Design a protein around this nucleic acid. Structure first.
Ligand SMILES: [Mg+2]
Ligand SMILES: [Mg+2]
Ligand SMILES: [Mg+2]
Ligand SMILES: [Mg+2]
Ligand SMILES: [Mg+2]
Ligand SMILES: [Mg+2]
Lengths: 95, 143, 49, 48, 92, 52, 354, 110
RNA sequence: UCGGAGUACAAAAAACCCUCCGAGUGAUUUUAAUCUAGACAAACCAGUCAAAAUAACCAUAACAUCACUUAUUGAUCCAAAAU
C-alpha cells in the first residue's frame, strides 16, 4: 500500500480489495466464498449452497481492508435500486 | 361494565387431549436408531400369544388407552378358537368400535416385515380401516 | 425533514420549491462529482405531513 | 419475442414429454429383456 | 353491513354468510391491517381486502373451492361421528 | 477402467445442463433428472463430453 | 478408577461360561417382548421415564365409589367353562373358523363389556383424559353403573355421548336423555361440568345442568338445581371437556347455597368446584357414573354468547413462542448476508436524518 | 523411511453438551465416528452420526434397552444369537423440552 | 498432501527421519432440489451438520448405496465455456 503517493502525496488504495469485496456503511465487509466456481460436479448440494452463499469478515480482516482502502469507499452511498441499501445500516446492536 | 365481560386474555386449557386433537402437540421425534419409532400420539400394538390375541392403543408415555382382548369374556364366549385370523379380525373390529366410542380416530401401526405380510393382521388392519379408524396419524403443524 | 424545513421557515411552500430552494435552505446537500443525480423523495414521515 | 419463443419451445418440448419418457422406459425394458434372454439362452446351451 | 346501501342485497347476504367470523354482535363488519408501519399503507391494505371481499361476494361463478390438507381431519372426524350418529330412536 | 465426465442437458426445451461421471465403455447416457426451471421430472440426454 | 454398581447389574445372572448349553431365543419378537418387559422395571440408574414424566411413579389413589359386585368365582368359572365347551362342541362354528367366514354380534359384545369390564376401561380413559386430575385432584372411582347419554338432533337422529366422544354444540343445544338401571328405592344426582372454558379462573369449572334428588331412573321428575345451558367454547381454544357425573345418595339432601335461579345466565354464579361440592356432600353422595365428551367451536356458539349470555364472542388464537436468536455480534464471522435480517425490527427502510 | 502418512489432525470427535445444559433446537449435542451415544427423545441423527437437539430444553443421558430395526441384518443376527436372559443396553441422549408449545391469547372480543 | 490404529489408557488438542495399514478410485440405481432457524470445528482460507417451509413421486422415505467409509483431493488469476 502506498501511504504517500508520488504525484499528489495522498494515500492510494489497492484495487484487488474493491474488486473482490464490498464494504457496508456499518463497518462490515462482504465477500464471496472461495471456490464457488471450481469443480461443482465433485461437491455436494449443501456444499455448493455454502459456496454460493455470501459471508462476512471479522474484525482483523475488516481492519486490514479499511487500512488498505481509502476513505472514498467508506462514504455513504445512495444508489438507485441498490440491493444492499437495506443492509447498509445496523439495528438492535446492544454493545 | 358487564360482569361477564372479564376475559383474562391468558387462557389456560387444562385438557391433555387438546393439543393432540388440534394436531399441534409435540410428537416425540428422535431415536431413528431403535425400533419402533416413537414419533406419535397414539400407537396400535398387537400381541399374538399362543393362546390369546390382545390389541392395545398406547399413548407415548406407555399407558393403555383402549384395549380389545380375546381374554375378555365378551369376545371369548361369542368367538371360537381365539387364535384364528377370524379372531384377529373380530378383535380389530371391536377395537375400532371402542376407538370410535373413545373419540380417537388416528393412530400409527408399525409392524415387522413378516407381520405386515401375514393374513390375520392384514385383515385386522382392513377391519380397523372399515370400522372408521384410519392409520397414518396426521402430520404435526409446525413440526 | 421537508415538514421540518417548512415549519422552521427554511423553505416556503408559497413559492415553488426546487432543488435550488432546498440547497439554499440547507435541507439537502448534492455533490455532482460523486455521481449524484439529485434528490429523491421517501415516505419516512408521510403520516404527519 | 425472446420470452415468447422460450415459452413456445418449453410448451412444445413438454407436450411430447410423456411420450419421450414412455419410449425411454420401453427401450430400457427391451434392453434388459434382451440381455436376460441372451443369458438364459447361453445357460441353456451350456447346461446340456 | 346491513346499513351498507352501496352494495346489492345478494352481495350483502353473501358477505354476511361468508365473513360472519369478523362481524361484531352489533352487525358492524370489521377489517384490520397491521403489516406496514404507515397508516396510509394500512388503509390501502384494508381497502384492497374490502375490494376482494366485494368481488368474491358479487361474482356468481364462485365454486367455493376448499383445501384438503387441513380438512381431511375434519372430514374423517365428521364421518366417524356420523357413524355413531346413525342411531335412530325417537325421543323428547 | 477410466471414467468420463459428460455434460447432459434437459429435454424440456429449457436450457439446463449438469455434469455426470460415466464409464467410457457404456452407451449414450440418458436419465430422469429433476429440472427446477420447469420443476418437473425431466428426461436428460448426453450431448457433450467435457473431461476424460 | 472403578466404582461399585448401586444394585444388581442387568446381565449378571446368566453364566458366561458354557454358552452352548444355554437356551437362546431365535425370535426378534421374543427379544422385543423381553426388552419391553425389562424396560418397565424401576431401574436404579437414570432411565427415560424419570426424566420424561412417569407422573410421580406409583400413586396411592383414594377410591371413592361403590364396592365391586360380589360374584361367586367358582360358579362363574364353571359356567364359563360349560359355555365354552358347548360352543366348542358345535361343528358349524369350526367350519366357519376354518373357512374364514365368521361374524360377531357386536351389540351383545358391547353390552357384555359394559356389564363386566366396561367400568375399568372407562376409568382408565378418564385417567388418560384427566377427569380425576381436575375434579377431585387425588381420587379415582370406578364407574360401576352404566350411563347412556344421548342428544336429539331431530325426530329420528340421536347422537350418543360415549367416554371421550366429540359432540358439537349444535347437537348439544338441547337437554340430553340419560338412561341407567336402578331400582325404585335410591336417589341420584346428575351434574354436567365444563372443565375448560372459564375465562377468569383456571382452577374453576362451569356447570351446565345440575339435577338432584332423582328417584330411580326418572330424571325429569327430579328437581333441577341448575337449568341446562348449551356448550359455549371459545373459537380459538377448542376441544373443551364436558362430563356428566352421576352420584348415588342415601338421604334426601336439601341445599340452599348451591341453588341456582331459573335464568342462571350469570357466569359469576356459574362457577363451580367439584372438590368443594363433594366435600360438602361427602356423607351421602358417592360417584357411580361418568360420561365425558369433547366439544369444539361452531356457528351455534355465537348465538349462546350473544342472545343468552349477553356478551361479545371472545376469539383466541394459538400463538407460538418467538424464535430464539443469539446475541448480535459486532463482526459476525462467516455468517450469511441475511444475518442482519434476523434482528431487523421491521421490513421498512428507515431514514434517520435524510 | 517405511512409515509414511501417519500425520493426521484430530477430528474433535467428542461430547459437546453434558447433562443439565440448556440447549436450543439445532444445537449439536455430540459428534462421533462410531455409534457411542445413541439419540433418544427429541434428538436427531445426522448422516455423519452426529446428534443434534430437535427441541429446546435440558440435555439428559440415560441407560436404556436396545431394540434394533428388523431391517438391520447384523443387529438382528446378534439379537437372535443373544442368550435367553441377555438384553442389550445402550446410552441414549435426550432433550427434555422446557418451553410449552404455545399459549391461547385473546385476539379480538367480537 | 489426506485418512485409520498406538504413542495420546477416561471431554478436546498434542510432536519426532516414532511402530504399522492405506488413499490420488472403482461398481450399481433410489440421479440424490430450492430456501433458512440453530449448532460442531477452526488463526484465516477452508470443511461439517441441520429443525421448519416450498417443487415431483408412496398420497408412510428419500442421508444416493457398497468396497474397515474415514481419505479418494487443489486457492486466486487466466484460458477455453456460451447462461
Ligand atoms: Mg452526499
Ligand atoms: Mg375367575
Ligand atoms: Mg494419529
Ligand atoms: Mg498434527
Ligand atoms: Mg467452538
Ligand atoms: Mg425438512
Amino acid at each position: 500500500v502506498t501511504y504517500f503517493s508520488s504525484r499528489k502525496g495522498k494515500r492510494k488504495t489497492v484495487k484487488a480489495v474493491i474488486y473482490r469485496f464490498l464494504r457496508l456503511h456499518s463497518g462490515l465487509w462482504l465477500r464471496r466464498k472461495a471456490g464457488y466456481k471450481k469443480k461443482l460436479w465433485k461437491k455436494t448440494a449443501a456444499r455448493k449452497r455454502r459456496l454460493r452463499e455470501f459471508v462476512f469478515c471479522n474484525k482483523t480482516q475488516s481492519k486490514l481492508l479499511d487500512k488498505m482502502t481509502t476513505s472514498f469507499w467508506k462514504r455513504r452511498n445512495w444508489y438507485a435500486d441498490d440491493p444492499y441499501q437495506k443492509y447498509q445500516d445496523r439495528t438492535n446492536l446492544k454493545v | 361494565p358487564v360482569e361477564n365481560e372479564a376475559v383474562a386474555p391468558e387462557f389456560t386449557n387444562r385438557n391433555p387431549r387438546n393439543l393432540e386433537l388440534l394436531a399441534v402437540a409435540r410428537k416425540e421425534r428422535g431415536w431413528g436408531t431403535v425400533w419402533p419409532s416413537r414419533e406419535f400420539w397414539h400407537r396400535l400394538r398387537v400381541i399374538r400369544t399362543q393362546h390369546h390375541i390382545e390389541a392395545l392403543v398406547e399413548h407415548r408415555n406407555g399407558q393403555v388407552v383402549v384395549s380389545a382382548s380375546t381374554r375378555e369374556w365378551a369376545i371369548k364366549k361369542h368367538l371360537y378358537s381365539t387364535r384364528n385370523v377370524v379372531a384377529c379380525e373380530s378383535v380389530g373390529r371391536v377395537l375400532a368400535e371402542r376407538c370410535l366410542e373413545a373419540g380417537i380416530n388416528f393412530m400409527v401401526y408399525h409392524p415387522t416385515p413378516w407381520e405386515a405380510a401375514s393374513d390375520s393382521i392384514k385383515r385386522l388392519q382392513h377391519a380397523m380401516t372399515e370400522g372408521g379408524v384410519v392409520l397414518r396419524e396426521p402430520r404435526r403443524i409446525y413440526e | 425533514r421537508l415538514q421540518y424545513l417548512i415549519d422552521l421557515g427554511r423553505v416556503d411552500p408559497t413559492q415553488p420549491i426546487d432543488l435550488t430552494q432546498l440547497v439554499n435552505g440547507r435541507g439537502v446537500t448534492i455533490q455532482p462529482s460523486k455521481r449524484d443525480y439529485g434528490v429523491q423523495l421517501v415516505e419516512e414521515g408521510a403520516d404527519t405531513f | 419475442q425472446k420470452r415468447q419463443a422460450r415459452e413456445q419451445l418449453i410448451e412444445e418440448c413438454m407436450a411430447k414429454m410423456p411420450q419421450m419418457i414412455e419410449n425411454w422406459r420401453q427401450q430400457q425394458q427391451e434392453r434388459r429383456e434382451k440381455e436376460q434372454a441372451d443369458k438364459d439362452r447361453r445357460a441353456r446351451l451350456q447346461a446340456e | 353491513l346491513a346499513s351498507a346501501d352501496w352494495i346489492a342485497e345478494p352481495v350483502r347476504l353473501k358477505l354476511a354468510v361468508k365473513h360472519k367470523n369478523r362481524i361484531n354482535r352489533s352487525g358492524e363488519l370489521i377489517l384490520t391491517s397491521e403489516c406496514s408501519r404507515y397508516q396510509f399503507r394500512n388503509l390501502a391494505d384494508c381497502l384492497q381486502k374490502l375490494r376482494d371481499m366485494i368481488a368474491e361476494a358479487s361474482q356468481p361463478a364462485k365454486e367455493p373451492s376448499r383445501e384438503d390438507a387441513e380438512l381431511r381431519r375434519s372430514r374423517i372426524e365428521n364421518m366417524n361421528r356420523e357413524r355413531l350418529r346413525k342411531k335412530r330412536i325417537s325421543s323428547a | 477402467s477410466k471414467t468420463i465426465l459428460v455434460k447432459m442437458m434437459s429435454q424440456a426445451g429449457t436450457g439446463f445442463s449438469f455434469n455426470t461421471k460415466r464409464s467410457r465403455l457404456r452407451e449414450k447416457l440418458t436419465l430422469l433428472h429433476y429440472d427446477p426451471v420447469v420443476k418437473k421430472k425431466v428426461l436428460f440426454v448426453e450431448q457433450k463430453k467435457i473431461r476424460s | 478408577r472403578r466404582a461399585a454398581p448401586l444394585g444388581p447389574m442387568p446381565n449378571e445372572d446368566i453364566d458366561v461360561s458354557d454358552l452352548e448349553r444355554l437356551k437362546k431365543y431365535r425370535s426378534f419378537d421374543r427379544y422385543r417382548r423381553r426388552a419391553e418387559q425389562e424396560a418397565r422395571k424401576p431401574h436404579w440408574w437414570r432411565t427415560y421415564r424419570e426424566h420424561f414424566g412417569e407422573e410421580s411413579g406409583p400413586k396411592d389413589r383414594v377410591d371413592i365409589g361403590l364396592p365391586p359386585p360380589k360374584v361367586s368365582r367358582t360358579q362363574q368359572l364353571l359356567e364359563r367353562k360349560q359355555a365354552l365347551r358347548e360352543l366348542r362342541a358345535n361343528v358349524e362354528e369350526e367350519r366357519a373358523a376354518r373357512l374364514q367366514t365368521a361374524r360377531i354380534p357386536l351389540e351383545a359384545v358391547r353390552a357384555e363389556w359394559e356389564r363386566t369390564c366396561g367400568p375399568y376401561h372407562k376409568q382408565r380413559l378418564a385417567e388418560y383424559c384427566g377427569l380425576y386430575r381436575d375434579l377431585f385432584h387425588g381420587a379415582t372411582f370406578v364407574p360401576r353403573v352404566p350411563l347412556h347419554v344421548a342428544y336429539a338432533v331431530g325426530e329420528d337422529d340421536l347422537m350418543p355421548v360415549y367416554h371421550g366422544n366429540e359432540v358439537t354444540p349444535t347437537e348439544a343445544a338441547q337437554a340430553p336423555e340419560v338412561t341407567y338401571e336402578a331400582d325404585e328405592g335410591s336417589l341420584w344426582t346428575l351434574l354436567l361440568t365444563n372443565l375448560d372454558g372459564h375465562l377468569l379462573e383456571p382452577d374453576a369449572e362451569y356447570v351446565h345442568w345440575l339435577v338432584t334428588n332423582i328417584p330411580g331412573n326418572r330424571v325429569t321428575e327430579g328437581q333441577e338445581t341448575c337449568p341446562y345451558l348449551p356448550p359455549f367454547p371459545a373459537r380459538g381454544s377448542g376441544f373443551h371437556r364436558f362430563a356428566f357425573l352421576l352420584f348415588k345418595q342415601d338421604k334426601r339432601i336439601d341445599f340452599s347455597g348451591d341453588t341456582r335461579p331459573s335464568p342462571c345466565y350469570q357466569l359469576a354464579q356459574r362457577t363451580f368446584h367439584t372438590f368443594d361440592f363433594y366435600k360438602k356432600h361427602q356423607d351421602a353422595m358417592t360417584p357411580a357414573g361418568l360420561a365425558f365428551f369433547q366439544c369444539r367451536w361452531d356457528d351455534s356458539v355465537t348465538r349462546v354468547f350473544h342472545q343468552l349470555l349477553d356478551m361479545r364472542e371472545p376469539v383466541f388464537e394459538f400463538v407460538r413462542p418467538p424464535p430464539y436468536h443469539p446475541k448480535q455480534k459486532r463482526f459476525p464471522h462467516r455468517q450469511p448476508l441475511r444475518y442482519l435480517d434476523r434482528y431487523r425490527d421491521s421490513h421498512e427502510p428507515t431514514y434517520g436524518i435524510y | 523411511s517405511k512409515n509414511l502418512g501417519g500425520k493426521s489432525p484430530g477430528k474433535r470427535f467428542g461430547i459437546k453438551k453434558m447433562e443439565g445444559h440448556y440447549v436450543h433446537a439445532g444445537n449439536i449435542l455430540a459428534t462421533q465416528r462410531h455409534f457411542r451415544w445413541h439419540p433418544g427423545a427429541h434428538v436427531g441423527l445426522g448422516k455423519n452420526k452426529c446428534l443434534y437437539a430437535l427441541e429446546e430444553g435440558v440435555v439428559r443421558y440415560t441407560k436404556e434397552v436396545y431394540v434394533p430395526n428388523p431391517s438391520n441384518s447384523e443387529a438382528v443376527d446378534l439379537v437372535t444369537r443373544l442368550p435367553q436372559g441377555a438384553v442389550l443396553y445402550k446410552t441414549f441422549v435426550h432433550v427434555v423440552p422446557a418451553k410449552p408449545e404455545g399459549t391461547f391469547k385473546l385476539v379480538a372480543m367480537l
